[PDB]
């Protein structure tokens, strides 16, 4: 007559026991088979926790188990859900409920605040999976009501305990109330600035601008999106806030007080950062050393020294980054390996308006290029010509960026030749500047060719620097921020707003959203905000984020699929006779080759999962939640692009597979590939400069003479200054770190996420496949014939797409989601 249940929870101080007893916590089971006069599952009596269970060893993570028994006669049917009310003042983290001999499992993993804070009682369902048409009739209304609850009403200031998911534009980055200089255009909701939506917070208008959301000490995210951590060192996402608000000011004072040289004077001054370290004022070290996360960033003598970790890129050769070989190799195996494109005609063309920027014809001449004996026509025809083209992307912003004090850039284009040995070599760099009548600047565009000696070698080195500044900016704002963090949030919101926790697609996709809204919210507050980390360390300054909006104009969901991307960029061609359906034009393109393996593994997984819940196309078209989910994801989440024809319709099994496959790819492998190499490659500022401060010098000037006499100083004066470098290195170190509680691809935070053994078996195969894939990539990295592109002169094995990783700054490991 009684159902024995076990409640596992975590007291707030983990992320005593006895206080949970008495009438502190009550649970009411809900029948999925027996309904009341309204068709709603019958609800049992309030049952309180009875005592502390201390039986099964399998119970870690500061978790505690509680015995409880429910008065549930077989006449009440089978329990399929349950209500829970917390009478204690402090919230606790509910892990799960297990009902024995009837076993029924509930995976909750949710914060339960005091009952008085909730409009309706917290409800949790058993781990069964149901498309809408399969929902037991007694749970149907509870299913839709919980979704209605999750959607809220689009109004109100969100509170810490709310679990309300909604959309809003990026109108919370500027800080006009503090200063007109901190005013920023609203990104999203206009044709001028289209942009993915983000999680609604509702703080209200600023005093000076009704279109901009006022500042807030805490940027809200639905409660369960804010991941707690057993180990403070794992709360990596809070690092950005501490860095911007506490550490950055401390660094600045050291410079304002002239306690450390304002500029790096030689490359060794930069290498010093991870060798002997940098000596800073005691009160500066004292301000940093006690902060969680931040303190894991540097070794210190506790008094004056801060030592950064040695970046992977210099671990074997501290000078290899300067080679043309590495410069080109990082375009296919570096931090930003997905921008290079095939070049099929010569010279490269521009779609920009010459009336505005001046004649846009390229000044690169074919006869000036060293293509290893190949003629231009031969290189073009054999598909050996490629380019890293930032000309059209940057040109529209060069004038405004260059009007800034201490910022000067070129819209660059780099031509690459695929040598017969399979490696890429850079053969020319065009440094373009806009030209319009009345220009005050005498600076002109120019082409720089490879050179190993003399001032020509310095000019070529600086040319590579201007290119990588373009690339770092594009990598951070587009490849990384826009394409992963920002593009994914809309889908997270829609999933919670329209797919029930019961829905198979919810279970398939949500693991790939872990910590995404959380890091994004913290990003809006300290990373991409007016005068935030990115604006204060990257070239575009106050134009940074709006540049990503301009790029978003051309963002295409279906082109995020890896095969489509490779084909679109001209680095692969459709080839039905191949395993992946595409033939790579650069056969040893690490990112793409390893990527296709992961892509295929995810595809197989999705294709094996969907069939378990959708027998035919009609079953997809007729899933009400799924249709509302996709419709909102598109028309609201990415609403500024709802008019585009390429959006899948989601009326077929094929379409569902495609959409889920792309979402999973972006959240896991794509993000991992562009994220975890940030410090490994960019930890040496010379290798990944984030900004450039001056254009090439005119012959006959002291600056030109410096290029001849002190090329390292010329280089350092051109790239990111020492102060912003310290800040940027710290943020990318944080962002390249894997928390020890990360959940990787092929893993789930709970083995009982679904009761369906079929889905569970498919997932297990997916995991074994990923392990199988890793062995293969290891073999690729150990293959001497692939050393040129997979390791390079920096001898850094390409491990960014290895599925697994231990915690730390490992340069490998694919998390399920955009978690940092
Ligand atoms: Fe990231």
UniProtKB/Swiss-Prot annotation:
Belongs to the lipoxygenase family. Induction: The hydroperoxide product serves to activate the resting enzyme. The activation is accompanied by the oxidation of Fe(2+)entadiene structure. This is Seed linoleate 13S-lipoxygenase-1. Plant lipoxygenase may be involved in a number of diverse aspects of plant physiology including growth and development, pest resistance, and senescence or responses to wounding. At pH above 8.5, only (9Z,11E,13S)-13-hydroperoxyoctadeca-9,11-dienoate is produced, but as the pH decreases, the proportion of (9S)-hydroperoxide increases linearly until at pH 6.0 it represents about 25 % of the products. Residues 193-215 are annotated as: Disordered. Changing residue 512 to Q: 20% of wild-type activity. Changing residue 675 to G: Reduces catalytic efficiency 5-fold. One of its GO terms (cellular component) is cytoplasm. Monomer. One of its GO terms (biological process) is fatty acid biosynthetic process. InterPro entries: LipOase, LipOase_C, LipOase_C_sf, LipOase_CS, LipOase_Fe_BS, LipOase_plant, Lipoxy_PLAT/LH2, Lipoxygenase_dom_3. CDD domains: PLAT_LH2. It catalyses: (9Z,12Z)-octadecadienoate + O2 = (13S)-hydroperoxy-(9Z,11E)-octadecadienoate; (9Z,12Z,15Z)-octadecatrienoate + O2 = (13S)-hydroperoxy-(9Z,11E,15Z)-octadecatrienoate; (4Z,7Z,10Z,13Z,16Z,19Z)-docosahexaenoate + O2 = (17S)-hydroperoxy-(4Z,7Z,10Z,13Z,15E,19Z)-docosahexaenoate; (4Z,7Z,10Z,13Z,16Z)-docosapentaenoate + O2 = (17S)-hydroperoxy-(4Z,7Z,10Z,13Z,15E)-docosapentaenoate. Pathway: Lipid metabolism; oxylipin biosynthesis.
């Amino acid at each position: 007559h009684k159902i024995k249940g076990t409640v596992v929870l975590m007291p707030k101080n983990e992320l005593n026991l006895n206080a949970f007893l008495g009438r502190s916590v009550s649970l009411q089971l809900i029948s999925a088979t027996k309904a009341d006069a309204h068709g709603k599952g019958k609800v049992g009596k309030d049952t309180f926790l009875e005592g502390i269970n201390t039986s099964l060893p399998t119970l870690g993570a500061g978790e505690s188990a509680f015995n409880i028994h429910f008065e549930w006669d077989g006449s009440m049917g089978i329990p399929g859900a349950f209500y829970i009310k917390n009478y204690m003042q402090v919230e606790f983290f509910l892990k799960s409920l297990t009902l024995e001999a009837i076993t029924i499992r509930f995976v909750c993993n949710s914060w339960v605040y005091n009952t008085k804070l909730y409009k309706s009682v917290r409800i949790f369902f058993a781990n069964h999976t149901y498309v809408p048409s399969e929902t037991p009739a007694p749970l149907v209304s509870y299913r839709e009501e919980e979704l209605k609850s999750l959607r809220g009403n689009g109004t109100g200031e969100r509170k810490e305990y709310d679990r309300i998911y909604d959309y809003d534009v990026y109108n919370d980055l500027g800080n006009p109330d503090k200063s007109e200089k901190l005013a920023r255009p609203v990104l999203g909701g206009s044709s001028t600035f289209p942009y993915p939506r983000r999680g609604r917070t509702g703080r209200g208008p600023t005093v000076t601008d009704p279109n901009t959301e006022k500042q807030g000490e805490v940027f809200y995210v639905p409660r369960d999106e804010n991941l707690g951590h057993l180990k403070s060192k794992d709360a990596l996402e809070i690092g950005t806030k501490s860095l911007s608000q506490i550490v950055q000011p401390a660094f600045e004072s050291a410079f304002d007080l002239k306690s450390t040289p304002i500029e790096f004077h030689s490359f060794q001054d930069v290498h010093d950062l991870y060798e002997g370290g940098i000596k800073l004022p005691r009160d500066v070290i004292s301000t940093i050393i006690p902060l969680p996360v931040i303190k894991e960033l540097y070794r210190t003598d506790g008094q004056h020294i801060l030592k950064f970790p040695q970046p992977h890129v210099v671990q074997v050769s501290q000078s290899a980054w300067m080679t043309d070989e590495e410069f080109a190799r990082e375009m296919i195996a570096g931090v930003n390996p997905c921008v290079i494109r095939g070049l099929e005609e010569f010279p490269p063309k521009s779609n920009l308006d010459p009336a505005i920027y001046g004649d846009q014809s390229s000044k690169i001449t074919a006869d000036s290029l060293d293509l290893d004996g190949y003629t231009m026509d031969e290189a073009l025809g054999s598909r050996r010509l490629f380019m890293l083209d930032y000309h059209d992307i940057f040109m529209p912003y060069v004038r405004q960026i260059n009007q800034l004090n201490s910022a000067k850039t070129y819209a660059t284009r780099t031509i690459l030749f695929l040598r017969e040995d399979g490696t890429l070599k850079p053969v020319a760099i065009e440094l373009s500047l806009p030209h319009s009548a009345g220009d005050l600047s005498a600076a002109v565009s120019q082409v720089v060719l490879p050179a190993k000696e003399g001032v020509e070698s310095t000019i070529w080195l600086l040319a590579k620097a201007y290119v990588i500044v373009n690339d770092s900016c594009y990598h951070e704002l587009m490849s990384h921020w826009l394409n992963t963090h920002a593009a994914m949030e809309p889908f997270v919101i829609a999933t919670h707003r329209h797919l029930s926790v019961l829905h198979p697609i919810y279970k398939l996709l949500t693991p790939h959203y872990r910590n995404n809204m959380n890091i994004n919210a913290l990003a809006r507050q300290s990373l991409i905000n007016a005068n935030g980390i990115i604006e204060t360390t990257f070239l575009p300054s106050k134009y940074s984020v709006e540049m990503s909006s301009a790029v978003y104009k051309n963002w295409v969901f279906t082109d995020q699929a890896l095969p489509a991307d490779l084909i679109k960029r001209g680095v692969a061609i459709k080839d039905p006779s191949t395993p992946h359906g595409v033939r790579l034009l650069i056969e040893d393109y690490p990112y793409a080759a390893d990527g296709l393996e992961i892509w295929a593994a995810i595809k197989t997984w999705v294709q094996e999962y969907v069939p378990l819940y959708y027998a035919r196309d009609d079953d997809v078209k007729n899933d009400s939640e799924l249709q509302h989910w996709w419709k909102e994801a598109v028309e609201k989440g990415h609403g500024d692009l709802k008019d585009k024809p390429w959006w899948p319709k989601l009326q077929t099994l094929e379409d569902l597979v495609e959409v889920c496959l792309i979402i999973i790819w972006i959240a896991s492998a794509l993000h991992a590939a562009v994220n975890f190499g940030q410090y490994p490659y960019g930890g040496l500022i010379m290798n990944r400069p984030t900004a450039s401060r001056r254009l090439l010098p005119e012959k006959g000037t002291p600056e030109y003479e410096e290029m001849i006499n002190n090329h390292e100083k010329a280089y350092l004066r051109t790239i990111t200054s020492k102060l912003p470098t310290l800040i940027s290195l710290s943020v990318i170190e944080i962002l390249s770190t894997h928390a020890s509680d990360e959940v990787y691809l092929g893993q789930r935070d709970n083995p009982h996420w679904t009761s369906d053994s079929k889905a569970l078996q498919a997932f297990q195969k997916f995991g074994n496949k990923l392990k199988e894939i890793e062995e293969k990539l290891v073999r690729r990295n150990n293959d001497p014939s692939l050393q040129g592109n997979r390791l390079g002169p920096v001898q850094l094995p390409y491990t960014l797409l290895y599925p697994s990783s231990e915690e730390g700054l490992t340069f490998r490991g694919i998390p399920n989601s955009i978690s940092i």
